[PDB]
Structure 1
């Protein structure tokens, strides 16, 4: 019975194969068949390439030795090499053109999801080329999805020597009959077969995957589109900044490039961006996913006034100052979306670009009290129930599991009505004691929110809604301004509180506004439609935020 899957890198997890360039070069330059391939394998186990693959020498040391072998091969074949020929150029192009074979990675991901131990076993080199980062990035993206990465140049062993297979078996802590081994080189497949391992010769991906699903008994081909990579909280870099004596802000950090500050809504976490964090980092950005003030590992003072927009924005500016960041792209959702538009209005110097999911830019009505404006819209009744200190805290803190399971549901899962909340006497008055688990979340993900909210509860989070008059007075100072920095408004078709139509007049304040729209998407945008969110944010970041 199988419980481990091993994949090669070249020609298996990454395509096109580097060997499938050496032959292409011969054809393009009209050189004798196999001329370059013979110079590559020259000397066999004693040759320059085996020394390179075992880690005895680096790729830059190997380049001239390979060039030397190319001359010896041409002298024997009675042919002459061109005047502009470069081994470095051939390998730079080959490595750069090599990309992840996506359906092969998805198959490995599906196998690991069903309990398999997955590993990459590869004959590779120590890359010291000026262009080494390209491969470094590819290896980083691939390695994270596997239990083990075994590189020949690191272990001092090479395929097909039998010692690497015994090393692989020891690393996996599995007998050979429990292991599937996928390779594009038949010679490298043989010693695994010899030990009793199930072996797959990879030519075209689809056939290799048909063979893989037949042997494992798990559907890998024609499967539904998978969700993006999520975050394991204990595998993240956790950051902490003291913004004032009693206030510390926590954030999760991933990637390199322009800083992208993610601001969640109510009653959420940095974890609400779990599907965006790996995607945005992979797209070339430095992600800073916040625990907003009053949440998770961030400080939660009890005073209502600590949660007015002016203070929250000032603290976000200090956060940037303390990290040494002159700017950040600000992306918000719900209450985070509201903060993000105010950051753009009051601190444009510090905001590289601004994006909001669901929350439209809501300007202050100078001729109406903010509480009257809330009252005029039946869907915003929950905000009035959130006003009296203690009332919503008691209902929300009573049963944390019930709170999150009731709130975090897709558009076709109900289970609460946001209108007549005060009349009904609560958010969960007509909700079950043990709500069913939404398709958007696992039991484990609910438990993360439960554990986070055990620290400070709902006082700090609910206080965000308890500064309406204060926020209105501050917002009135910005009534003559316009948002002229790059901006994105993303609407969700089925958000019945933050309706797409609420954003219709935004172009009056933000003339150069860009938009995104997600159909069949509820209030919990990031987890409802993660793939679509990622596609819209990445496209907008690459075009408007560098």
Structure 2
């Protein structure tokens, strides 16, 4: 049983990594590109980009531990722990060459440590729409003159007593629609069918919990990254962010400038947080061209 439909020419498969059964969707030929999703979503956010990339690359899109059809991590949900699973998965398919990495939202949190610790393994890097966990996150405001802020959910999701699971259970589809649309410019791309699919996936009890455990580990991830960031990133890097409602704007590139020597950035007007779906055509073009250099 597949939670989401597989594109023609791709296969849905699993690999055991350190005792954890990881789900992924894979297709194409050539050097490896790994695409890593974020919160509220699964591998499927990449389903429009995948067949285009597959003309030039071997493409793998895993479900993050605990999410989609992947088993929860057996170590923990901090960025360093999760990055081990993703790094070892990629290396199963690209043992002798460096691979490319594209990540969105918490996919960034879950890959940054393996990028900085294994720089020779990473040919090119694309990061979109999330802060790397560092002290900058403590400056985002709780409330705005226009209403709810961008990241008040950091506290909601990190709270103890299973606050988020307890309040959201039974209302998973309702909450996810609110959350997605509050962070979107182009809400029309999120059809009832698409929202149904994403909601059913993250509503699995272990997935609903896994979702928030990433946030419960965020402060630990920040502390981890304070040490890791002493080593700058050397590989060619591109950042993308949305310039419309829900987007990170200039923050993405400005933060990345502190981490990478060789970085170019784009802000996409008329697009919010969910770039692969809200602004598929220009986002896909920018990623494809950057990786094809």
Q: TM-score scaled by structure 1?
A: 0.47
The counterpart of 2:164, out of the listed 359, 379, 392, is 392
The counterpart of 2:190, out of the listed 441, 447, 454, is 441
Instruction: Give the direction of change, closer, same or farther, for the CA distance of 1:449–1:252 in structure 2 (3 Å limit).
Output: same
Task: Answer whether contact 2:242 2:271 (CA < 8 A) is retained.
Answer: yes
Q: Matches of 1:374 and 1:384 in 2, distance apart?
A: 11
Instruction: Give the direction of change, closer, same or farther, for the CA distance of 1:522–1:319 in structure 2 (3 Å limit).
Output: same
Aligned to 1:530: 280
Matched, 1:481 2:231: yes
Partner SS, residue 489 of structure 1? strand
* 1:4-55 Cα shifts (integer Å, max 9, x gaps): xxxxxxxxxxxxxxxxxxxxxxxxxxxxxxxxxxxxxxxxxxxxxxxxxxxx
Residue 357 of structure 1, CA deviation: 1.2
Partner SS, residue 287 of structure 1? strand
Task: Answer whether contact 2:129 2:247 (CA < 8 A) is retained.
Answer: no
Matched, 1:353 2:124: yes
The counterpart of 2:11, out of the listed 223, 231, 237, is 237
**Correspondences of 1:65-464 after superposition (within 5 Å):** 232-233=5-6, 236-245=10-19, 247-282=20-55, 284-300=56-72, 306-326=76-96, 327-361=98-132, 364-365=134-135, 373-374=137-138, 377-378=141-142, 379-389=150-160, 390-409=162-181, 411-412=184-185, 438-455=187-204, 456-464=206-214
**Correspondences of 1:29-44 after superposition (within 5 Å):** none
Task: Answer whether contact 2:113 2:228 (CA < 8 A) is retained.
Answer: no
Q: Matches of 1:408 and 1:521 in 2, distance apart?
A: 13
Partner SS, residue 521 of structure 1? coil
Q: Matches of 2:62 and 2:257 in 1, distance apart?
A: 28
Partner SS, residue 353 of structure 1? strand
Instruction: Give the direction of change, closer, same or farther, for the CA distance of 1:343–1:459 in structure 2 (3 Å limit).
Output: same
Instruction: Give the direction of change, closer, same or farther, for the CA distance of 1:232–1:311 in structure 2 (3 Å limit).
Output: same
Residue 307 of structure 1, CA deviation: 0.4
Task: Answer whether contact 2:36 2:64 (CA < 8 A) is retained.
Answer: yes
Task: Answer whether contact 2:241 2:247 (CA < 8 A) is retained.
Answer: no
The answer for unaligned runs of 5 or more in structure 1 is 1-230, 414-437
Residue 233 of structure 1, CA deviation: 2.9
Residue 394 of structure 1, CA deviation: 2.3
Q: Matches of 1:400 and 1:376 in 2, distance apart?
A: 26
Q: CA RMSD in A?
A: 2.4
Task: Answer whether contact 1:358 1:492 (CA < 8 A) is retained.
Answer: yes
Partner SS, residue 244 of structure 2? coil
Matched, 1:514 2:287: no
Q: Matches of 2:277 and 2:40 in 1, distance apart?
A: 14
Using CA pairs under 8 Å that are at least 6 residues apart, name the structure with larger relative contact order, 1 or 2: 2
Aligned to 2:145: none
Q: Matches of 1:258 and 1:495 in 2, distance apart?
A: 35
Identify the structure with the greater strand proportion: 2
Q: TM-score scaled by structure 2?
A: 0.85
* 1:316-350 Cα shifts (integer Å, max 9, x gaps): 12212333534321100110123333332122122
* 1:446-484 Cα shifts (integer Å, max 9, x gaps): 222233234333111111111133213321222321111
Task: Answer whether contact 2:185 2:278 (CA < 8 A) is retained.
Answer: no
Partner SS, residue 306 of structure 1? coil
Residue 497 of structure 1, CA deviation: 6.1
Q: Matches of 2:89 and 2:141 in 1, distance apart?
A: 35
Q: Matches of 2:80 and 2:185 in 1, distance apart?
A: 37
Partner SS, residue 398 of structure 1? coil
Partner SS, residue 233 of structure 1? coil
Partner SS, residue 253 of structure 1? strand
